[PDB]
Amino acid sequence: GWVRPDLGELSKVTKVKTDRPLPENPYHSRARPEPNPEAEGDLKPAKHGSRLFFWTM
Amino acid sequence: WIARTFYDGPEKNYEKTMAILQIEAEKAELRLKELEVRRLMRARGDGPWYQYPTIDKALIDHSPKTTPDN
Numbered sequence A: 001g002w003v004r005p006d007l008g009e010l011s012k013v014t015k016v017k018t019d020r021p022l023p024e025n026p027y028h029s030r031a032r033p034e035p036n037p038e039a040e041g042d043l044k045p046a047k048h049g050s051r052l053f054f055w056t057m
Numbered sequence B: 001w002i003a004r005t006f007y008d009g010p011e012k013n014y015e016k017t018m019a020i021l022q023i024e025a026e027k028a029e030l031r032l033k034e035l036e037v038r039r040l041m042r043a044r045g046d047g048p049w050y051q052y053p054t055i056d057k058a059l060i061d062h063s064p065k066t067t068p069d070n
């Protein structure tokens, strides 16, 4: 009683009912390094200007 | 008469010198601090400055790759 699969059926993406657990770390990665501080604030004018040599602004 | 019509009292120049000295000393200490901060950031790279680009991770394709083992 076997019916031959039609064109376009064996190439389908199907779902699998499995009871095997999903690997939590399949890549065996290390812990990612901590990011840079990402400072935030509200801008204020540069103190006493550019402070480059004799320039007062 | 000359002092009244051409010049001012010692207080003005005295306190102007006080203010000028205060500004210049602050600028000097700011310059020294800025140099030290630059040295530290260039040495460790943990600051906002001297940040050199690395590969963007949004370019990685996370999909099956015709082979189970990547």
Ligand SMILES: CCCCCCCCCCCCCCCCC[C@@H](O)O[C@H](CO[C@H](O)CCCCCCCCCCCCCCC)COP(=O)(O)OCC[N+](C)(C)C
Residues within 6 Å of the ligand: B004, B005, B006, B007, B008
């Ligand atoms: C015996 C009695 C007289 C004694 C001799 C006195 C003669 C004085 C002449 C020399 C003056 C030296 C300079 C003095 C002025 C300095 C610049 C400025 O400070 O003076 C301003 C005043 O200057 C005058 O307005 C201009 C003086 C110009 C003198 C020119 C004399 C020669 C002119 C000749 C012309 C002849 C006619 C043309 C013939 C062809 C006012 O200053 P000010 O910024 O407030 O100061 C702040 C402090 N305050 C507020 C208390 C004053």
